[PDB]
Write a protein that binds this DNA or RNA. Structure first.
Length: 163
DNA sequence: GGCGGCCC
DNA sequence: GGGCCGCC
């Protein structure tokens, strides 16, 4: 195996992601979100986290490392990663919205304030398997950071040695 | 038209 | 709250 079974399923969901495009490349919301979660999985940090702390932590990485003009709005990639089955959200009424729109996304997180994080099987996988971490880091760097310097982001996520 | 997103 | 773009 389930490590090999889960790793292949994990990497398949990551490769199926469809990020929004700028003129010169895909926007960095989803890879920055994922690498934040990968670092947390590696160090065994709390998988399930309150939205206020998740929003602030991802937002700070968006501000510092948003090399294609990203806004500090983690609501976009979190919703997209949830739809892909990579992210869990708990404590909300009704259905989770898609990452389409703007104000409705912010208002939904402000009202529902869901608790969540990377899905439990993938968090556990990346905590246990250094090979799975290296695999997804390389794949995300290949897809999203062509012509960009990922080193400051890797050190801010605690993944410099593995990336 | 849907979904990931920016601009008002 | 809205319209709209890129890509599917």
């Amino acid at each position: 195996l389930t490590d090999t079974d889960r790793s292949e399923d994990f990497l398949r969901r990551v490769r199926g992601l469809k990020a929004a495009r700028t003129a010169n490349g895909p926007r960095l919301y989803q890879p920055i979100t994922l690498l934040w979660a990968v670092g947390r999985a590696r160090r065994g940090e709390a998988r399930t986290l309150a939205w206020a702390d998740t929003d602030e932590a991802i937002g700070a990485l968006l501000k510092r490392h948003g090399a294609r003009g990203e806004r500090p709005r983690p609501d976009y990639p979190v919703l997209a990663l949830h739809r892909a089955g990579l992210w869990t959200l708990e404590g909300h009424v009704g259905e989770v919205p898609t990452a389409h729109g703007d104000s409705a996304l912010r208002n939904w997180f402000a009202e529902q304030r869901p608790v969540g994080g990377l899905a439990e099987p993938f968090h556990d996988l990346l905590h246990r398997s250094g090979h799975s971490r290296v695999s997804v880091i390389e794949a995300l760097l290949t897809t999203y950071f062509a012509g960009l310097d990922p080193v400051p982001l890797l050190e801010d996520t605690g993944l410099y040695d593995e990336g």
